[PDB]
Amino acid sequence: HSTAETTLDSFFSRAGLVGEIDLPLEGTTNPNGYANWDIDITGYAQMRRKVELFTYMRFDAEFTFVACTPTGGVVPQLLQYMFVPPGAPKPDSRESLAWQTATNPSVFVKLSDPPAQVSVPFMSPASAYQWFYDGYPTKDLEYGACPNNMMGTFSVRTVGTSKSKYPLVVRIYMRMKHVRAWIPRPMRNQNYLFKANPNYAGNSIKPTGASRTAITTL
Amino acid sequence: SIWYQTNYVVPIGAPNTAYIIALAAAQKNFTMKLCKDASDILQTGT
Amino acid sequence: SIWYQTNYVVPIGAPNTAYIIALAAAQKNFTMKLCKDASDILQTGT
Amino acid sequence: ETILEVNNVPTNATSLMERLRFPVSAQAGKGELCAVFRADPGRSGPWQSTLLGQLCGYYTQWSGSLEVTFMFTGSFMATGKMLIAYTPPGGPLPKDR
Amino acid sequence: VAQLTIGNSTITTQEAANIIVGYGEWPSYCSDSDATAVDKPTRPDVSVNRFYTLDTKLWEKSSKGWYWKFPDVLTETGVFGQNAQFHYLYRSGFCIHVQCNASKFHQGALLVAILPEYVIGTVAGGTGTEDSHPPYKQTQPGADGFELQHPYVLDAGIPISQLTVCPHQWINLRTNNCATIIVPYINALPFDSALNHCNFGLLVVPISPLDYDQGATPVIPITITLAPMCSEFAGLR
Amino acid sequence: VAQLTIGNSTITTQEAANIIVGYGEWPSYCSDSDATAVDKPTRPDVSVNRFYTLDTKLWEKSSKGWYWKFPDVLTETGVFGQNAQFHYLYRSGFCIHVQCNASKFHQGALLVAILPEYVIGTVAGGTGTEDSHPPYKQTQPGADGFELQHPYVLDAGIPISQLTVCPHQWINLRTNNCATIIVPYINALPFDSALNHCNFGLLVVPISPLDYDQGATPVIPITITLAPMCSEFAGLR
Amino acid sequence: VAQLTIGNSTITTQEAANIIVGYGEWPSYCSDSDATAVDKPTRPDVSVNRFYTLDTKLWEKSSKGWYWKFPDVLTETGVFGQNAQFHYLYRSGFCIHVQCNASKFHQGALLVAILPEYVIGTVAGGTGTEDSHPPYKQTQPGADGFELQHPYVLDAGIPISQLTVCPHQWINLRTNNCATIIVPYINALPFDSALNHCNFGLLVVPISPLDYDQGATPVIPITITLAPMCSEFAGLR
């Protein structure tokens, strides 16, 4: 019965899959053996609903990178995951001098080696992130969108001058730690429409939960 | 179960029908064990 | 302004409409300055 | 305390607001059963509207004492007696008042 | 809001409204002398001390009222039903808790009371010429209770106009809903049968008829939850 | 009866009913560290600390509810509107007071609450295919508020069934009318804009529909009076 | 329930609800100086100090209100009627107690008040051209009272909207019924006539009209019971 499983850190812990990069040898998606992933903790489906229980949050995260082949095979390919601190520019080519700039923390690891993990501190220049922003950050509709909440950008890529020899799939897991929440708000009860705002189906409004026949009949 | 102990009584001039709101909540001694992320409301890519 | 937060709820047998009386008065910290005998109700000779 | 949708019957779109409250009136005679629900903070039912309920869904098992409150919103001139009764696990809903 | 949790049960009842303790006595076990002096009666503290929530009864604009008979009501469903069936002698206090889920747009009043040795009496035929002692349905109405046919005379020629002279509690919708009564063991014997003699009866009558302007759920659910305080049994079978 | 008088204003409000202090904190000024360390922010105690009484809204048998956005609501009318317009940075607590003039022959219940960062969301087209962020009418509804279109989901897919998890207060006609809430400055920044970002929203929804037997004034006026507690501004323009 | 018994009378009134003591003074006898200095006024403590229960008036959906005039009201029935008739000078305090027997299915509100020197004024003809001082029926309406013709102006061009500025007490059916007021002797003379000058008047007006869903006894009885506190008389005839 220990009320410890109901804390905030015990509610928001656990490494969840938030990203899945894909470097097919040949095809459409990521045709340059590299891709840019913007840290988005909603990469985990049911996470949005959860964090959105509060108005202000603060936390750190431990990202883990489980990469393999689509088959699930291990291969002797060396990778480089780079981190783009919100504010610095991201790579655009397979050798944009971006991967070169030190102020962009990179971490080389082979697929042979166990998953790579690193910790991103609470970025935001604010006191805390905030899932809601009732205004405009002083043409276009810039409502509800809160600026400084950007945690950064991970840029995965196969080390080396030439393309990779095998197809690769990098899965990105992130567990948030040391959490502080504020201003609890009602629990979402209408399906989500966009990752952006809280819009909902303006006719397809369903009841918070299942319904019955008569109020007297159980 | 809620029952009508007496009939509803009102004077001439008042609404001959009212409503009752219900407010629940658990007491101090409440516990919760094991986490389950069951959530039908999920995040969708625009 | 007074608003209907919920609809009027009453059981079968009661007046489906009631009234509300309003009672005003100033608080302790009230003042009055300058006299003005404005009175439309005036004394009339039989 | 969060609003328990005991009257979780109207499903229509523009009626969902009624689910928040059940009614009492002249039509009902003494003894009549007004409403009835279960003490199931977790499971589907009227509890799903409460924050309590919704949180439980994020958990597998639990235990504790609960606390339902009932607010009469009728007229001021309205009077009468309602009998609320709890029947612990087992004993089916009492036959009559 | 504050949910009491005594057993594998958890009722989310009000924080602590007013409860009428019957005849001013908390149900207790026993000093050291009974209908068994060389027979130390085991006191079920195990699963015999949890919350039981009887099938909610629906209150209509017309319900005449209901009643249950203790200890019978539970000898049915429950591990307390297990005890009352496999044991000879019995002594146990109680604690009933009647709740009413309705809206501020309804109205009514329920008189909830405990009446020791509640002996029923049917019509006695039709007009009054048949010594027909009520069915085994009115003497022990299981856990689903039974309805009054003549609420005014409580089905026993006694006027309900005076029922308040028993441990009672009112449930006026516009003022509350939950009502509680702690019943102590009342009998002319320390240890009595828990299967044939019903120590008392719980009545719950609509004194002020249920009502609602048309359009509100017409049936208000009355949820009776009870807890066996200080169970006691002697000799199993 | 006892009329409070803080400013060239004089509201004749009840003596001292119950007021819910938000998140348990009285709005205060500031220690000695902010978004301005070599910029001592002037604290308007002058006419920025008086009573403002918004144009009373009329409650009908059909009102879906209303909402206002702070600090916007006042940047309009008032000398506090003068400040919020000619200043860059802003920090201020509050104190809303919603009154309801109705008779004992009416009935209803209003849930009045404060919801930080109240982000609206219109229909999103009609059925749900248009990233149309709500108009400049729903994001900052001046001092006359705005009506909810979908009260059940508070216009933001959140269930009102749970709105009480915010600083709230009920207004059940048969029991009271005036309700008060003291809001403290809630933001992820010491000093924030007082013209673009609305620190929160005040909702006031009819949970129990207004009603009256035919013949009584059908519209009950809801009078919202508010007082800016601890205004703070930095750098004029 | 608790029945007060001061005299050969026994009213079974509530235990002790709230009573408004008039102008904040308990009716008392007298120091040692009056309209009689070599005439020690006998103070009836005998049968002049018991409970009188005036013929209950019936409240309808249409009653305009009623009023009685003291000390007249009792100079009729009673041994206090014996005194007020056979004595010259008089001084006496009081204590009225207005009760209302109705059900929780009715509704209304009565303003009960005491108004010193209650001078009536009929229509003054019809439109307003006749110095006709009201009948001997409106100046001294015995123990059965008299009805207001123009409740709004209390039959004396004074607005009832302000009657509360007198010793008063409300009787809102949904909240109570019995109301009490202790009146002290109010006069510009120590000892005044108890047959020609009526020290005051007791008004009881329905401010919130009586009402009941169809089918309930439409007339609610208002029972006025009063007790003469500190009677005083001088010189018999």
Q: How far is the C-alpha of C21 from the C-alpha of G92, rounded, in Å?
A: 35
Second CATH level (architecture) for the domain A1-218: Sandwich (2.60)
Which of C13, C19, C21 is the closest to G213 by Cβ?
C13
Q: Would the CB atoms of D25 and C6 count as touching at under 8 Å?
A: no
Three state DSSP letters for E8-45: CCCEEECCCCCEEEHHHCCCCCCCCCCCCCCCCCCCCC
Burial class (CB in 10 A: 0-12, 13-18, 19+), B34: exposed
Rg (CA), chain C: 22
Tokens of A49: 């609903």
- Please report residues of F whose CB lies closer than 8 A to that of B14: 105, 107, 213
CB contact under 8 A, D80 and G211: no
**Are the C-beta atoms of A118 and A63 separated by less than 8 Å?**
yes
Handedness of CA G151, G152, G157, G162 (dihedral sign): positive
Contact F24, F167 (CB under 8 A): no
Task: Tell me which residue of E79, E91, E87 sits closest to E234, measured CA to CA.
Answer: E87
Residue D62, strand partner residues:
B32
Q: Domain residues of chain A, as ranges?
A: 1-218
Q: If residue E181 lies in a helix (H) or strand (E), which one and from where to where? A: strand E179-182
- Cα R_g (chain B), whole angstroms: 22
What does E119-149 look like in DSSP terms, one character per residue? -----TTSSS-------TTTS--GGG-EE-S
- Which residues in chain E are immediately followed by a break of C to N over 2.5 Å? none
Provide the sign of the torsion angle of the four alpha carbons F25, F27, F31, F36, taken in this order.
Answer: positive
Report the amino acid identity of residue F210: L
Would the CB atoms of E108 and B5 count as touching at under 8 Å?
yes
Q: Which residues contact residue E188 at a Cβ distance below 8 angstroms, ignoring those fewer than 6 apart?
A: none
Q: Rg of chain D's alpha carbons, rounded to an integer?
A: 15
Instruction: Answer whether B46 touches G (CB < 8 Å).
Output: no
The answer, yes or no, to whether the previous bond of F221 is cis (omega within 30 of 0) is no
**Alpha-helical runs (H) found in chain C:** none
CA distance G207 to G169: 12
Q: A67 vs A70, A117, A155, CA distance in Å? A: 9, 12, 14
Residue with tokens 């003494």: D30
Residues 6+ apart with CB under 8 A from G196: none
Alpha carbon separation from G207 to C21, F184, G87, G210 (Å, rounded): 8, 42, 39, 9
CA distance F84 to F72: 9
3-state secondary structure of F1: coil
**Do the bridges between strand E179-182 and strand C18-19 make them parallel or antiparallel, or are there none, so unpaired?**
unpaired
Distance CA E39, CA A195 (A): 72
The whole-angstrom separation of Cα E28 and Cα E46 is 16
Query: Helix and strand tally (H, E) in chain C?
Result: 0, 1
CB A82, CB A155: distance < 8 Å: yes
Judge whether D33 and B5 are in contact, CB under 8 Å.
Answer: no
Strands B2-4 and A78-83: unpaired
Closest CA to A31 of A171, A157, A159, A161: A157
CA atoms in the 13 A half-sphere facing the CB of A191: 15
| CB-based contact E226:B32 (threshold 8 Å) | no
Cis peptide before E209 (omega within 30 of 0): no
Neighbour tally for C39: CB within 10 Å: 7
Whole-Å CA distances, F59 to E237, F65, F206: 69, 8, 9
CA G36 from centre of chain: 27
With DSSP H G I counted as helix, E B as strand and the rest as coil, what are the percentages for chain B, rounded to 5? 0, 35, 65
Pairing assessment for the beta strands E52-53 and E107-116 based on DSSP bridges: unpaired
Q: Which tokens is C9 given? A: 């709820």
What is the distance, to the nearest Å, from the Cα of residue E206 to the centroid of all Cα atoms in its chain?
A: 16
CA distance F166 to F159: 13
Angstrom distance (rounded) from CA A36 to CA A30: 9
**Nearest CB neighbour to A216, from listed D35, D48, D55:** D35
CB contact under 8 A, A210 and D38: no
Q: Which amino acid is at D2?
A: T
Q: What residues have CB less than 8 Å from A170, skipping those under 6 apart?
A: A19, A20, A21, A22, A23, A65, A66, A67, A79, A81, A156
Distance (Å, rounded) from C-alpha F160 to C-alpha D3? 8
Q: Is A184 on the interface with F (CB under 8 A)?
A: yes
Indicate the pairing of strand E12-13 with strand D66-72: parallel
Provide the token pair at E9. 């049960």
Q: What angle do CA E159, E108, B23 make, to 5 degrees?
A: 135
DSSP strand pairing (E179-182 vs E19-21): parallel
- Distance from C-alpha of A17 to C-alpha of A8, rounded to nearest angstrom: 20
Look at B19 and F131 and tell me if their CB atoms are within 8 Å. no
As a whole number of angstroms, the distance between CA A127 and CA A105 comes to 24
Q: Which of residues 132-191 of E touch F (CB under 8 A)?
A: 174
Per DSSP, the three-state class of F84 is helix
Question: How many Å apart are CA A152 and CA G101, to the nearest integer?
Answer: 75
The size of chain F, in residues, is 237
Q: Where are the beta strands (DSSP E) in B1-46?
A: 2-4, 18-24, 31-35
Q: What is the distance, to the nearest Å, from the Cα of residue A165 to the centroid of all Cα atoms in its chain?
A: 28
**What are the CA-CA distances from residue E114 to residues D38, D95, E118, E165 (Å)?**
24, 17, 9, 10
d(CA G38, CA A49): 93
Two tokens, residue C18: 């009631």
Q: d(Cα E109, Cα E112) in Å, to the nearest integer? A: 10
Q: Is E115 left (phi over 0), alpha (psi -120 to 50) or beta?
A: beta
Cα–Cα distances in Å, from E173 out to A173, C9, E65, E148, G75?
54, 11, 16, 21, 46
**CA A64 to CA B36: how far, in whole Å?**
22
Give the span between the Cα atoms of F89 and E151, in whole angstroms.
Answer: 71
Residue with tokens 């279109």: F149
Q: Which amino acid is present at A92?
A: D
Which residues of C are less than 8 Å from B12 in CB distance?
Answer: 15
**A3 contacts chain E (CB < 8 A):** no
Given CB atoms, is A213 within the 8 Å cutoff of chain E? no
DSSP-derived letter for residue A166 is S
Tokens of A57: 């949050």
CB atoms within 10 A of CB G39: 13
State the smallest CA–CA distance between residue C9 and chain D in angstroms.
4
Q: Do chains G and A touch (3 or more CB pairs under 8 A)?
A: no
Residues paired with residue E90 on neighbouring β-strands, in sequence order? E192, E233
- Gap from C5 CA to chain D (nearest CA, Å): 9
* Resolution for the entry shown, Å: 8.8
Which residue is closest to E105 within chain C, CA to CA?
C9
* Beta bridge pairs of residue B4: D82
Strand partners, A58: A180
Which residues share a beta bridge with F143?
none
Q: Are strands F19-21 and F179-182 parallel, antiparallel or unpaired?
A: parallel
Quick check: helix, strand or coil at residue A68? strand
Is D40 within 8 Å of chain C by CB?
Answer: no
Distances, alpha carbon A116 to alpha carbons A109, A154, F128, G49, in Å? 7, 13, 41, 99
Name the token pair of G205.
């007006």
Query: Is E191 within 8 Å of D3 (Cβ atoms)?
Result: no
Q: Is F70 exposed, middle or buried (0-12, 13-18, 19+ CB in 10 A)?
A: buried
- Residue numbers of F between 51 and 90 with CB closer than 8 Å to C: 56-61, 63, 66
Please report how many Cα atoms fall inside a 13 Å half-sphere around the Cα of residue B14, on the Cβ side.
52
Residue F199 · residue F183 · CB < 8 Å: no
**What whole-number distance in Å separates Cα of residue G92 and Cα of residue G69?**
14
Reported in sequence order, the residue ranges of chain F that DSSP labels E, i.e. its strands, are: 19-21, 52-53, 57-59, 66-70, 87-90, 96-100, 104-116, 146-147, 168-172, 179-182, 192-193, 200-212, 220-226, 233-236
Left, alpha or beta for E53 (phi > 0: left; psi -120 to 50: alpha)? Answer: beta
D25, D52, D91: residue with CB nearest E106? D25
Amino acid at G233: F
CA–CA dist A72, A65 (Å, integer):
14
Distance CA A49, CA A38 (A): 20
Tell me the β-bridge partners of G179: G98
Candidates E6, E12, E138, E161, partner chain D, best to mutate (most D CBs within 10 A): E12
Residue A103: CB atoms within 10 A of its CB come to 9
Q: Degrees (nearest 5) of the Cα angle G18, G23, G29? A: 100
How many other C-beta atoms can be found within 10 angstroms of the C-beta atom of residue G158?
16
Q: Is the peptide bond before F206 cis (omega within 30 degrees of 0)?
A: no
Q: What Rg do the C-alpha atoms of chain E give, in angstroms? A: 18
Q: Is residue A59 within 8 Å of residue A178, measured between CB atoms?
A: yes
Q: Which residues of G touch C13 (CB under 8 A)?
A: 105, 213, 215-216
Which residue of D lies nearest to E142 if distances are taken between CA atoms?
A: D91
Q: In the structure encoding, which two tokens stand for residue G54, read together?
A: 């005036």
Tokens in use for B28?
Answer: 């101090």
Neighbours of chain A (3+ CB pairs under 8 A): B, D, E, F
Indicate the burial class of F174 (C-beta count within 10 angstroms; 0-12, 13-18, 19 or more).
Answer: buried
CB distance D32 to E61 below 8 Å? yes
Per the CB < 8 A criterion, the answer to whether A2 and A118 are in contact is no
- Which CA distances in Å does F157 have to A211, E74, G212? 18, 45, 42
Residue F188 near residue F99, CB atoms below 8 Å: no
- Identify the structural domains of chain G with CATH numbers, from first to last: 1-237 (2.60.120.20)
Alpha helix (H) ranges present in G78-130?
79-86
Residue D78 — left, alpha, or beta (φ > 0 → left; ψ -120 to 50 → alpha)?
Answer: beta
Cα separation, D76 vs G174, in Å, equals 6
Q: Report residue F47 as tokens.
A: 């006419």
φ, ψ dihedrals at D53, nearest 5°: -45, -60
